[PDB]
Design a protein around this ligand. Structure first.
Ligand SMILES: COc1cc(/C=C/c2cc(/C=C/C(=O)O)cc(OC)c2O)ccc1O
Ligand SMILES: COc1cc(/C=C/c2cc(/C=C/C(=O)O)cc(OC)c2O)ccc1O
Ligand SMILES: [Co+2]
Ligand SMILES: [Co+2]
Ligand SMILES: [Co+2]
Ligand SMILES: [Co+2]
Ligand SMILES: [Co+2]
Ligand SMILES: [Co+2]
Ligand SMILES: [Co+2]
Ligand SMILES: [Co+2]
Ligand SMILES: [Co+2]
Ligand SMILES: [Co+2]
Ligand SMILES: [Mg+2]
Ligand SMILES: [Mg+2]
Lengths: 488, 488
């Protein structure tokens, strides 16, 4: 393959495309014998060179990595998420779909097809592996063989065109709660709220509209509500016609927080929209209710975090203003005005990729983990981030005491998103382990790190070496072996 | 897996164990559209940590790499050679066989089993891939799927216990010509000469004895003769009982060259043994007859080239004396004495891993390629050699004119054995391409280089990037697609 000599395709961003199997990876330390299951994660990784001769990181085909941990060892299986895009391009031997979220640039032969790269999450639910991309229905895969099933349209009961890559599982019911924005077509203001039974059946789909079309990448869920931030990374057909990146950030638009009832009978009039001054937030650590209030914890930045989705008025990217810090947004459903009740920074550590013990989804909670950008640490090698942030620490916040733990990966490495592994179904919050990929940039390889989740400062208890490098990853999740067809 | 923190298992020698598939590897330059076939090569690569807690490079399980070149692209498939050792250890989840060529160190449960790691050659013949190790019958594999068949004992017609990893194909008949030393048991002085029909049937097996048991790793073949050098890397059960490496070099023993008729009716009295002063040679570039003389071209060193098979009298390894230079040994079958007719250095370039256009096997020939150790070149990174030689150039010798070509891989790389690809069955000698793996040590990855075989100084015409590193390799070979079940 002849790939471009551009940053999106060179160095740490060289295409990999490895499908492989390796049991019993070389490792150091002690892999807890308690562990029996697998950590799935996804990297964008281009099957073919881009039609345009350049592209962005977020547009690579999804490659799924599974780390099966069992018997004190770690195995890897890596396979493509075989989206319709992947299959059509594989058959043609070339790229057919064009630039990011831009159907104007697709070959005529794929007009109307799902454009998904299934590249943003590798999530386990209802016995399936979900390889997810927010512009289409999710792909599903067999979590044991990692063969691909196809797109999940729930027996035709789903009528929205899209499905999120940030599904939540409600611990009270076991339902998956999801959204799909641009639900009636590209750049539309329609959104669907979906709930899916533990057995994989669509329970309901509820339609509503948002203040403006924007990247609705993540969201929170509480007992009663979908908690949907409206942040002005905006797109339009006009941008696409002009050849601009689909999304661009508008510093002049307000940010909203929508509180949408989790009800099949939802009507637009049931929604409350709270409004605040412009800022940027993407991911949600968790949301929960307290009395008539809703709290959602997000890494908030002063301005855009996506340099490749630039300021719509032509401003150069501002890295300092892109530093996000975990912040609690509180709204009161009983409040008279549309103002937020409070906005409260929860840490001065800058960070992103927030995670919780997912048993606490929607509930008051004590612990959160993040990737931290610690700009005071030495750096001899940089890499691993699509936007150029160096994620060099694992951070744990204790909301009860305020305490913070930090673990730095050293001066030639960077880190990928952590994932929490509960010790058992009924173990206390945070009792378990954290796993995450570490980019060993000087060695051009990756490790899987395993930490005791509440004692990270001493470093990982096991380090699993991969004999090759993973690419930049997005989201990942642990599932116990019995949830994924792997051995007891 | 917990592997030792010793040189045989760290850095460039970290275990890899990658089984993978990647079509359409990222590449630069122009892969000749003429190419349609595959280059196979093998790396020792330990499935499990060694029983003893340390080991040598030559003892790793064979991992077979196939580079399928077709349609101007290169694909990789990598799979284990599933020897009986591999299978038994895989089932047990641990190492069962011990140190190199030392059955005293095996678990009792594998007493009597073939100890082969099939780690020394990946050779194509009779529609099969042969994964070869000189202590056992060869393993065979499907060259298209790379599944393993098992050990080839030729329908029970083979009675020797061993089979070489340096098979030759006689261009006059298409037969494979092979030896098997230690043919009646470990450290025995019995050797078999085998010829195998193009259809894979054993034609004959002829037994003889050699002056002393030693590592009979390679040999030459001519129209009439097996040409067998006897070089005193010697082994014994006494060494094994003392816990010494199986082989050690004895500077006090003579070197012989045996000229053994290629005849099923061979008797010991038919063999001529020529004798010379001690030296070291391992590989054979080619051998051929001229009148009543036999010529064989070998990289000759003053002393041992294997530091891990040390001097038997306790001398420290001498790297300067380990420098080998291609040298023609000539004996005359009509000569009265046992002296060689001539010993003539053919180049002052130090090098090893000699290769020819294999259509010239046994014939007078013009071209030879080697890996050169050019000690005058700068080196910022070292790696890639089991004995510590830096193989940093590709070298071509023209025996007609004397001319030499050199291509240096640069200061952070090293090279693996080249292999010649003929343009067509009837093309002139040397008309075709050279392929070889290049270790990009600073990048912790490997490339496959493709050269115009007689114009190497301009560098490779294509560079195929692998997104991971291969380990040190031994021998490899190209086969056309129609010889290996791959597409026309
Ligand atoms: C893969 O495709 C999509 C991805 C996403 C989101 C990715 C994401 C990435 C980062 C990277 C940080 C670093 O590298 O330091 C940060 C974020 O929030 C601040 C993000 O929301 C959105 C649409 C896609 O189509
Ligand atoms: C894999 O197992 C076996 C291998 C061989 C031979 C390997 C070989 C290696 C080198 C390496 C050079 C470097 O690294 O620079 C040089 C040689 O001749 C001078 C050799 O004959 C022999 C027995 C085995 O059991
Ligand atoms: Co996300
Ligand atoms: Co404006
Ligand atoms: Co920190
Ligand atoms: Co590592
Ligand atoms: Co679980
Ligand atoms: Co050899
Ligand atoms: Co002696
Ligand atoms: Co040279
Ligand atoms: Co490369
Ligand atoms: Co051929
Ligand atoms: Mg269904
Ligand atoms: Mg047979």
């Amino acid at each position: 393959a002849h790939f471009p000599d551009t940053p999106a395709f060179t160095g740490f961003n060289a295409p990999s495309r490895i499908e492989c199997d390796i049991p019993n990876l070389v490792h150091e330390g002690t892999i807890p014998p308690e562990l029996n299951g697998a950590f799935f994660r996804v990297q964008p990784d281009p099957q073919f060179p881009p039609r345009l001769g350049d592209d962005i990181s977020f547009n690579g085909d999804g490659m799924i990595t599974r780390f099966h941990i069992h018997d004190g060892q770690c195995d890897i299986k890596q396979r493509w998420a075989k989206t319709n895009k992947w299959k059509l391009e594989n058959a043609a031997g070339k790229a057919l779909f064009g630039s990011y979220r831009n159907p104007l640039t697709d070959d005529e032969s794929v007009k109307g097809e799902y454009r998904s790269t299934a590249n943003t999450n590798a999530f386990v639910f209802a016995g399936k592996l979900w390889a997810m991309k927010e512009d289409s229905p999710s792909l599903t895969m067999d979590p044991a063989t990692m063969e691909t099933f196809g797109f999940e349209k729930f027996g035709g009961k789903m009528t929205g065109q899209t499905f999120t890559a940030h599904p939540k599982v409600d611990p009270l019911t076991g339902n998956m709660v999801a959204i799909g924005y641009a639900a009636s077509g590209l750049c539309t203001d329609d959104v669907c709220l979906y709930e899916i039974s533990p057995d994989g059946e669509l329970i309901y789909e509820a339609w509503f509209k948002v203040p403006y079309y924007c990247m609705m990448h993540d969201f929170g869920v509480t007992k009663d509500y979908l908690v949907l931030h409206i942040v002005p990374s905006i797109g339009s057909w006009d941008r696409l016609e002009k050849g601009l990146p689909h999304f661009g950030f508008d510093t002049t638009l307000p940010v909203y927080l929508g509180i949408i009832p989790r009800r099949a009978d939802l009507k637009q009039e049931d929604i409350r929209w709270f409004k605040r001054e412009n800022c940027f937030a993407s991911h949600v650590m968790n949301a929960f209710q307290e009395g008539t209030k809703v709290h959602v914890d997000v890494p908030e930045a002063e301005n855009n975090m996506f340099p490749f989705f630039p300021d719509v008025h032509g401003a150069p990217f501002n890295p300092q203003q892109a530093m996000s810090r975990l912040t609690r947004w509180t709204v009161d459903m009983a409040s008279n005005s549309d103002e937020f009740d409070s906005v409260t920074r929860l840490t001065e550590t800058a960070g992103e990729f927030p995670r919780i013990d997912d048993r606490m989804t929607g509930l008051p909670y004590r612990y959160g983990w993040m990737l931290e950008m610690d700009m005071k640490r030495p750096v001899e090698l940089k890499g691993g981030s699509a936007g150029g942030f160096l994620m060099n620490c694992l951070f744990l916040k204790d909301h009860q005491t305020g305490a913070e733990q930090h673990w730095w990966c050293g001066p030639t490495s960077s880190l990928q998103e952590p994932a929490f592994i509960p010790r058992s179904k009924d173990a206390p919050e945070g009792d378990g382990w954290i796993v995450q990929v570490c980019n060993r940039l000087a060695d051009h390889k990756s490790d899987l790190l395993i930490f005791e989740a509440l004692d990270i400062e001493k470093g990982p208890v096991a380090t699993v070496h991969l004999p090759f490098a993973l690419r930049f990853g997005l989201h990942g999740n642990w599932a116990n072996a019995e949830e994924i067809g792997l051995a007891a």
